[PDB]
Amino acid sequence: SEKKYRKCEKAGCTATCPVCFASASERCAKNGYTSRWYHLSCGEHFCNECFDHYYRSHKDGYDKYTTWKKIWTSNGKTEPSPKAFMADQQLPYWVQCTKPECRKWRQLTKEIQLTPQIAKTYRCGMKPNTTSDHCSLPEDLRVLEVSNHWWYSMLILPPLLKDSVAAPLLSAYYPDCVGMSPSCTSVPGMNRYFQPFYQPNECGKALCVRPDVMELDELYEFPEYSRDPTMYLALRNLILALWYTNCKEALTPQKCIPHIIVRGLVRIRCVQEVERILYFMTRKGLINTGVLSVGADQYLLPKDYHNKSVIIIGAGPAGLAAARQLHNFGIKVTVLEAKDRIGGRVWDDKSFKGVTVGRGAQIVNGCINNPVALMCEQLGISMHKFGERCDLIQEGGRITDPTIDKRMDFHFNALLDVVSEWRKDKTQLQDVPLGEKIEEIYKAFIKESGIQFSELEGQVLQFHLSNLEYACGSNLHQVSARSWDHNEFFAQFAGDHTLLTPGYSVIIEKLAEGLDIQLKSPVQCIDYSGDEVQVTTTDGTGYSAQKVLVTVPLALLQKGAIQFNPPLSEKKMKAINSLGAGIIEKIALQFPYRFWDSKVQGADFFGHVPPSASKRGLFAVFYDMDPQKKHSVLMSVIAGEAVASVRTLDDKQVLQQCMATLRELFKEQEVPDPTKYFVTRWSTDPWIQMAYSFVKTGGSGEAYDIIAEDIQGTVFFAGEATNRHFPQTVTGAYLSGVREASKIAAF
């Protein structure tokens, strides 16, 4: 009469007495003998009678199983089996007592389906969906087993979450390939800029994670998930979904737990992992970031990561970002800024009636997943997507026919295409200045083709040339042909380019809120010999801490303004000197009325066709600073060779030359005098001296990576000049501070 066993089917199982969790069949083995004891985990087994109850065609619960099967096979890629069925449909739920000093795990009865409402409110031995004696009872012994690694080793199937908050975003994916149950019959309200997941077979979008693939740095930290990442993916994806669903408060483990819905003891494992994973993504700045603020005893990282102190040099976006991160983590942070204000190259003039005019940055280039878009969401502020339209207006007042604009843009880009071909097989030593290579290709193309451009077509080509010089912040003869667009090899920020109407100052101010910031404290010296870094200001003040982070602009690193002891390495100096310190300047003009409205007809900007290639980049674009079209403020830009021509002019002389230009651009009409203006002088600001970085002839994009290497795990570097993927921008500077705060916290 066949054979029967007390013991589990799996050699090495730690259950000395399997007991059937199902009790689905009339002849369930309860806790005795059966023809096979089917193993789900070390703590969960079901007898063969209950196995036949669902499996065999002549048995009762066969319709229930066959129906689940059909749902399973059509929505998922994971095979259906009785074990998979049991784990998705028959294992009981486990929940923690929500009383703070208890937190004990309990098994719910079978008919109860775990809601996030139950998980938020459950207390020991009180019937859910609803004395303190029931808390003192010991947990089921199987609970403690779960937290060992060998428990996960002995788990036969990975968990599949139900009703994950991630699910509305992952519809393009098989639910089980991203850790969600296929038997689960279930993005309005989320910010259009939060797109944290790639769609399948999609790349080239910055800061998107693949919802079905762990990343290298994730596998490094969680190698136990390398073979089968189902479970890690489920929890990471859940945390991301929860964060972007509410980026204005800190996302705690307490907050994640009631959204982790899975049957069986494995839920305990998930609740224990979510917390580890959460602290990891916090340190890495993927969540719980932006201008989020925490109070005392509400720090974002456990007291372990708290045994450090940091001095941060420079209170620009990179410095304040690291300071805000490190502070939120619970690390002592002091920021020493040279100037008498924070912000660095973010400095918003607020004195123009009705608008905020930035003397430094005010544009966000690519808003999807951009942390600046995150921080705007957190602050409730709005960004203005730039319009496409930008007439090229001639001195004289003629508006250049758009087909000329477009045709010369074509020829121009066709020149850059030849550079990209030429450079493919050339090393850093073979490099050649970009402008020089363009002139060669152009003069070769003119000579070969016979074509003859009108004067205007040539001037319009000069305009497109000036824009490139603006993007590099340099005449193109200092810019590397090989490596000027180096960072476009990496995924870039998709989406809208915007004018940050309220100005970056609003973000910079909120980042700095509440931090120990010593202004008028320019750092003279950093000595990282000895047990602690010693930092000294220009008047002799001394500050001390265990680690120091440097965010000074590239120009200041090039000029050696801070004495380093020991000196920076030769490798680091060569990198620092291989990047160029690009420069632009800005002028803002306020008028008594919007004199351009009739001609410009609402566009966000208009173009200034340069008269000659010498005057190239002199007020090339005028920006209308009020997207609501009520106030009268224009802003324009000096780039390229034009920067060196106006160093010997005072502000009034620059203003006059701008006004002469506007009046030529509007020659057929009257232009009022300006009533208020400013002219920036970044290139002579002693502690900045630049607008943003670029790669000079002979250098490589790797220069950014090299400038970013820490020294002795003790001196760290951040700043736009240190972000290889995202050079130049406030965004790239911000992310580099987060990057460095992640490095520092790791110790």
Ligand X SMILES: [C]C1=C([C])[C]=C2C(=[C]1)N([C][C]([O])[C]([O])[C]([O])[C]OP([O])(=O)OP([O])(=O)O[C][C]1O[C](N3[C]=NC4=C3N=[C]N=C4[N])[C]([O])[C]1[O])C1=NC(=O)[N]C(=O)C1=N2C(=O)[C][C]C1=C(F)[C]=C(Br)C(F)=[C]1
Binding segment for ligand X among 40-48, 357-365, 380-388, 568-576 (CB under 6 A)? 357-365
Q: Is 380 annotated as a binding residue?
A: no
The single residue among 314, 435, 617, 699 that binds ligand X, judged by CB under 6 A, is 314
CA distance 149 to 273: 11
Number of Cβ within 10 Å of residue 250's Cβ equals 18
Shortest distance, CB of residue 384 to ligand X, whole angstroms? Answer: 13
DSSP string, 403-458: HHHHHHHHHHHHHHHHHHHHHTT--GGG--BHHHHHHHHHHHHHHHH-----HHHH
Return the H-helix or E-strand segment holding 233. helix 230-245
User: According to the binding rule CB under 6 A, does residue 283 interact with ligand X?
Assistant: no
User: According to the binding rule CB under 6 A, does residue 715 interact with ligand X?
Assistant: no
728 binds, among ligand X, Zn ion, none (CB under 5 to 8 A by kind): ligand X
Six-digit token string for 206: 């910055």
Binding segment for Zn ion among 116-124, 458-466, 701-709, 730-738 (CB under 5 A)? 116-124
Six-digit token string for 327: 């502070």
Binding segment for Zn ion among 123-131, 188-196, 253-261, 673-681 (CB under 5 A)? 123-131
User: According to the binding rule CB under 6 A, does residue 336 interact with ligand X?
Assistant: yes
Amino acid at 672: P
Shortest distance, CB of residue 633 to ligand X, whole angstroms? Answer: 15
DSSP string, 192-213: TT---BPPTT----TTPBPTTS
Q: Which is nearer to ligand X, 301 or 735 (CB)?
A: 735
**How many residues line the site for ligand X (CB under 6 A)?**
42
CA distance 31 to 672: 94
Instruction: Name the maximum alpha-carbon separation found in the chain.
Output: 109
Residues 6+ apart with CB under 8 A from 272: 146, 147
The single residue among 405, 485, 624, 720 that binds ligand X, judged by CB under 6 A, is 720
The single residue among 256, 333, 730, 744 that binds ligand X, judged by CB under 6 A, is 730
Residues 6+ apart with CB under 8 A from 578: 695, 696, 698, 699, 700, 703
Q: Is 203 annotated as a binding residue?
A: no
Check: CB of residue 145 under 8 Å from CB of residue 14. Answer: yes
User: According to the binding rule CB under 6 A, does residue 729 interact with ligand X?
Assistant: yes
Q: Which is nearer to ligand X, 179 or 319 (CB)?
A: 319
User: According to the binding rule CB under 6 A, does residue 264 interact with ligand X?
Assistant: no
102 binds, among Zn ion, ligand X, none (CB under 5 to 8 A by kind): Zn ion
Q: Is 311 annotated as a binding residue?
A: yes
User: According to the binding rule CB under 5 A, does residue 119 interact with Zn ion?
Assistant: no
Cα-based angle 2, 8, 9 (whole degrees, multiple of 5): 65
CA distance 432 to 322: 37
User: According to the binding rule CB under 6 A, does residue 316 interact with ligand X?
Assistant: yes
Q: Give CA torsion, residues 198, 204, 209, 212, to 10 deg.
A: 50
Is the preceding peptide bond at 258 cis, omega within 30 degrees of 0? no
User: According to the binding rule CB under 6 A, does residue 551 interact with ligand X?
Assistant: yes
Q: Is 351 annotated as a binding residue?
A: yes
Query: Are β-strands 676-679 and 516-518 bridged in parallel, bridged antiparallel, or unpaired?
Result: unpaired
The single residue among 269, 327, 586, 739 that binds ligand X, judged by CB under 6 A, is 586
User: According to the binding rule CB under 5 A, does residue 91 interact with Zn ion?
Assistant: no
Binding residues: 8, 13, 20, 28, 39, 45, 47, 50, 97, 102, 124, 135, 308-364, 523, 720, 728-730
The residues that touch ligand X, with contacts defined as CB under 6 A, are 313-319, 336-339, 344-346, 360-363, 365, 522-523, 551-553, 556, 561-562, 584, 586, 680, 682, 687-688, 691-692, 719-720, 728-731, 733
The residues that touch Zn ion, with contacts defined as CB under 5 A, are 8, 10, 13, 15, 20, 22, 28, 39, 47, 50, 97, 99, 102, 104, 124, 135
